[PDB]
Design a protein around this nucleic acid. Structure first.
Lengths: 138, 220
RNA sequence: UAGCGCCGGCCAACUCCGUGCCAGCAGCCGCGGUAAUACGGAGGGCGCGAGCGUUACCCGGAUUCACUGGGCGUAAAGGGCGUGUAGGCGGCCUGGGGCGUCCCAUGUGAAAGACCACGGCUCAACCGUGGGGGAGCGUGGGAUACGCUCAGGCUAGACGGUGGGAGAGGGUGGUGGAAUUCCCGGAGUAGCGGUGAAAUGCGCAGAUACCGGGAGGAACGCCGAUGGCGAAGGCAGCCACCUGGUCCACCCGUGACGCUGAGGCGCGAAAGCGUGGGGAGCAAACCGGAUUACCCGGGUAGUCCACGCCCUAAACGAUGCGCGCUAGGUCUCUGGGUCUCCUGGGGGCCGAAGCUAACGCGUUAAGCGCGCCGCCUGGGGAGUACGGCCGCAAGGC
């Protein structure tokens, strides 16, 4: 059965990205939509909206790419190069304020589920709180 | 529209052959055939013609590559009715990436045709004459039209981007923009400026090439 | 007072003599049989210097036990296959608790050591004085996003209902024909059979060909498939009964009832074995013949059945199970619909992206992810020895 929804969402995004789709669908959830809004704000995705698919709530994600490249392999540069899931079922990862990782010298983002809502690494450091480490994107 | 529709432009290949990447130009399926959306064809044609006219008025040269059975005559006539070089017999591996080597062959061809029009052939017993004549025949068969390239062209015009995938690949390697009259079974990614239409049915090829050549002539 | 090591590559330092697989050097690769930068001695050079080398031990290099940071198709590594206990993990929407989790204050975290700063020995080692830092654990307070728990709901997972479908899936009885071998007859003449060629062998007690009647055992010719069923091992005549699994349609009921699974329990080709039956044909062992100085003629256990053991394989897809996402083309088996076509499930062949040391895999992944389990850590010695458990034994773990 489906054991990890957030990992599933990350995998769906990655798979759709690698084939240069304009859209992808993931089952709707509050946590998922929070992650999606966080991703959209940092300009990793074009946008998202809540759609209805065969009487079931779904979230449609719009993917963003770079300009068409010159020469052989003219496929556009990806915006989301790499998206891992840190805290998995069976091994939960928690970090304090002093232990929030810096991803790619600040060129990436680490998304935290803090006590004050789902924040990025920067917002978590600014507010001075820690929590479950969800994912890193660069 | 109203020009392409009667030319059989919007008639593609059977469902056995179509490429998934080309679905963005397919309109619908009729009687087990693919129909190309002629509107999208119109915008793409407009864009490619704008590019062609800009290049022509800049003074650049376009190389025409059509190596099908039927497209030979039309390509030959259209290129001849312009300053544009053409290849229609066969695409030799390395016409572009190995342009230096083939330039040597072009020079050999020109010197040979000059030699046969010279009074020093009274020597060289007739067997050597036969050998040289056969060599000249081969060269003028293959290298005709290609003689008009003094250097690498600025663009390329391929009729079937799959029949001539090698030329497309070579054009990619050297950052030469690719213009193609691609069809259902083609890859749109390898073509910068694409005309979604039929590459069979001589009518369509003639129409597109005639229009393009007229635009080139006008834009001089 | 200037010594010690080294000069083939790692690794910075090259020539001349003695040497001829001898004397010897060596951490590895290796150097030495008359032209050695590798051996021994000189000259020169390099590195360190009152030290320079050697041996022993630890860490690193070793991502070579991999949490950071590995792998199991062919390199060592997927259990022979199921069911399932403990355990691990776990859909969508609200609410209460604040156990995990995060934050703040505070107590502790001795001194010395580590760090920073300033000073005392003429410098330094050494020492002194201040200042922080500090994993962890108490104590008080705060937060509720994610885990946990509790309460109330939802149908997308799972199960049931209803109406159909295909199938060598299994067990129990019954019986259909074609062979093969014997028995009983009728006719039959000299061979039959066998081989690369032959021999052994059978036949005058009349063989082999052939006609009829009878007995007995074993296996199911065409259909037949690159087909189907099953969790594996496996399953082909036909008929009937008792049963297992599975697919589609209606979306009708339930509300998360799910996944995996250390031990346990069960199944497990073929060959063996105990206790009784049966024995047509084939055939280990064995008796013969012969040639190329394997092959033909006979034949025992065994292959067949009932009960009980044995538990092994190239038990292979050399690929554990479950779920989700990622172009298609083509051939098949089986359903449903509005039937050139759509829509499910199963089995093959090419091949996008991607992956791989490569071969190759590719919607039946060896791709991208998650959960759980089982294994791997150079080759032999060795699946050996000892010990334990299971078998009548051979043997198995």
């Amino acid at each position: 059965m489906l054991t990890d929804p957030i990992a599933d969402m990350l995998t769906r995004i990655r798979n759709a990205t690698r084939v240069y789709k304009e859209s992808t669908d993931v089952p709707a959830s509050r946590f998922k939509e929070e992650i999606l809004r966080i991703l959209a704000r940092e300009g990793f995705i074009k946008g998202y909206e809540r759609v209805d698919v065969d009487g079931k709530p779904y979230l449609r994600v719009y993917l963003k790419y770079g300009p068409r490249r010159q020469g052989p392999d003219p496929r556009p540069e990806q915006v989301i190069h790499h998206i891992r899931r840190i805290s998995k079922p069976g091994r939960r990862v928690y970090v304090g304020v002093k232990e929030i990782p810096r991803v790619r010298r600040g060129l990436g983002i680490a998304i935290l589920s803090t006590s004050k809502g789902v924040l990025t690494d920067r917002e978590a450091r600014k507010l001075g709180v820690g929590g479950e480490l969800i994912c890193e994107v660069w | 529209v109203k020009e392409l529709l009667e030319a059989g432009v919007h008639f593609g290949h059977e469902r056995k052959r179509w490429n998934p990447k080309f679905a963005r130009y397919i309109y619908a399926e009729r009687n087990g055939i693919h129909i190309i959306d002629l509107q999208k064809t119109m915008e793409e044609l407009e864009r490619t013609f704008r590019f062609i006219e800009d290049l022509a008025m800049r003074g650049g040269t376009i190389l025409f590559v059509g190596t099908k059975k039927q497209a030979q005559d039309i390509v030959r006539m259209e290129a001849e009715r312009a300053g544009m070089p053409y290849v229609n017999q066969r695409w030799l591996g390395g016409m572009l990436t190995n342009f230096k080597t083939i330039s040597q062959r072009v020079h050999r061809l020109e010197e040979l045709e000059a030699l046969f029009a010279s009074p020093e052939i009274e020597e060289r017993p007739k067997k050597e004459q036969v050998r040289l004549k056969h060599e000249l025949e081969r060269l003028q068969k293959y290298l005709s039209g290609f003689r008009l390239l003094k250097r690498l062209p600025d663009a390329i015009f391929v009729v079937d981007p799959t029949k001539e995938a090698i030329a497309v690949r070579e054009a990619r390697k050297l950052f030469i923009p690719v213009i193609a009259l691609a069809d259902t079974d083609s890859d749109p990614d390898l073509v910068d400026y694409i005309i979604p239409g039929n590459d069979d049915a001589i009518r369509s090829i003639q129409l597109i090439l005639s229009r393009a050549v007229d635009l080139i002539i006008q834009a001089r």
